[PDB]
Design a protein around this ligand. Structure first.
Ligand SMILES: [Zn+2]
Ligand SMILES: [Zn+2]
Ligand SMILES: [Zn+2]
Ligand SMILES: [Zn+2]
Ligand SMILES: [Zn+2]
Ligand SMILES: [Zn+2]
Ligand SMILES: [Zn+2]
Length: 201
């Protein structure tokens, strides 16, 4: 009894006018993600273009809600391969893993994600950068057994650690050098605490 006029790619507003102008009244506006059509253009009608409709009949449309979009999972504290799969199943597959140091997250675990958790994010051009954990950094402890503890504080601090010390008398180590040192220099560890015995005089 009549073509469904064509409204694919038009606003709802222009669509009613083409419908009304044809005796049809639109009615029933649903929405979708489209690859192909920009947000707000129409994608599909449901008698369907040029398919038969009766006059006074209504025709439903489905409008584009822009492109395919999703709520970012949280993956902080998951192990790397699990984290990657949470997002594979979700459509997030453009993922760059960047290894870094960390005082919370297990070696191998995700410390931190690019795009913030539970935001909605578009499977189009999501450059997902994930920060994997390496451990805490090992720094080196230069030995100071003999030598101005006064300087040595300054080394050690500037650089990782905090430094703790107490005083003994020695007539075998100049008032102020170092009688002993705690983490036996020349290993490497965290931002830990180096303890000193300093000749008191
Ligand atoms: Zn067309
Ligand atoms: Zn009908
Ligand atoms: Zn000594
Ligand atoms: Zn000296
Ligand atoms: Zn002692
Ligand atoms: Zn003395
Ligand atoms: Zn302490």
């Amino acid at each position: 009894y009549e073509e469904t006029p064509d409204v694919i790619g038009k606003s709802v507003k222009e669509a009613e006018q083409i419908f009304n102008k044809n005796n049809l009244k639109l009615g029933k506006i649903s929405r979708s993600y489209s690859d192909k059509y920009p947000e707000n253009e129409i994608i599909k009608t449901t008698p369907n273009t040029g398919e038969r409709v009766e006059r006074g009949d209504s025709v439903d449309v489905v409008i584009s809600k822009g492109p395919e979009k999703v709520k970012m999972p949280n993956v902080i504290g998951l192990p790397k391969e699990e984290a990657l799969q949470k997002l594979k199943s979700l459509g997030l597959k453009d993922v760059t893993i960047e290894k870094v140091y960390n005082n919370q997250a297990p070696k191998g675990y995700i410390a931190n994600q690019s795009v913030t958790a539970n935001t909605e994010i578009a499977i189009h051009d999501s450059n997902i950068k994930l920060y994997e954990s390496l451990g805490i950094k090992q720094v080196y402890v230069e030995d100071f057994e003999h030598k101005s503890f006064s300087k040595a504080k300054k080394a050690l601090e500037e650089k990782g650690f905090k430094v703790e010390s107490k005083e003994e008398y020695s007539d075998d180590i100049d008032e102020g050098d170092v009688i002993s040192q705690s983490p036996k220099g020349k290993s490497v560890d965290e931002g830990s605490t180096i303890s000193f015995v300093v000749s008191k005089g």
